[PDB]
Amino acid sequence: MRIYQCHFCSSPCYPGHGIMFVRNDAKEFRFCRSKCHKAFKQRRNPRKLKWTKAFRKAAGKEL
């Protein structure tokens, strides 16, 4: 199957795994290691979170 990427981590999800909850928007977000989920629920800033793909982008961790 194709890989849905756990958005927060941005990691590719080898077709199964994780949970969805509804933003009550049109799309739903997929969650990896619960660590990923909890931080998300924590509503922490991906810009700050090292693990996040976002971290990479903003950090200099990159180009």
Binding site: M1, R2, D25, A26, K27, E28
Partner: protein, 224 residues
Amino acid sequence: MATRTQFENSNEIGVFSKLTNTYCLVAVGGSENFYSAFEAELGDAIPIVHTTIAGTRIIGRMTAGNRRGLLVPTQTTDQELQHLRNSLPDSVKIQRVEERLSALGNVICCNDYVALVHPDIDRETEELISDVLGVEVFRQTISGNILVGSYCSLSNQGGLVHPQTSVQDQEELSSLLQVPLVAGTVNRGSSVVGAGMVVNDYLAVTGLDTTAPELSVIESIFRL
């Protein structure tokens, strides 16, 4: 003509099939009695593509489209998409649409000229629909329901809407869709005419439970 059938023991043909003037989509795991309902009167006329959408078999509610194009949810797998592109004629565009109001088939109601969309749809999406289907799009509600594709069966000949739709909306909708519209029911009392039957300019397939009066209105308004 107009025929009756069932997917298993379900009369909601519109849930498991999608019919246009240039193609027909049917759920992958149907029975011969179900498939025949189409094969018997479509013959080698138009492609009858078996398929799944996002892994499900409720392809009628999961998609929307007409002769020029077909809209499929984002979750449509690349395998299903490749299979569709290969089976359907080249003149039809297949586009993934990202909308979460409901299933595409409930949000969109169209023929080859006009399309009604869920009244809360965003502008970007409404333009995409008009673009891919090459049709005029209007946000509307049929008798108050926002799930237009679920309460309206439409062809280029006529249309059937929720039985409680006022005559005033019927008159206005007729003008808007450019076809005669009449409030009615399908499958013995169901007001979900959009999901209970599929129809195009030359054939209408509904459920075995559609009464005599209901089938009369169908072959009369869709001119079959």
